[PDB]
Symmetry: C2
Subunit: 24 residues, 2 copies
């Protein structure tokens, strides 16, 4: 099975990049 | 830098695991 990742951004005041990965 | 990751779960049954990584 394959891993998928994507960048998600959060406002904290900079904007923080976060990597979100799941197994599709 | 160093990546800090953690498991997050959405109990929706069927539980959806995801991994979230930010960089320090
Ligand atoms: Cl974190």
């Amino acid at each position: 099975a394959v891993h998928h990742c994507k960048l998600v951004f959060f406002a904290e005041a900079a904007i923080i990049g976060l990597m979100v990965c799941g197994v599709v």
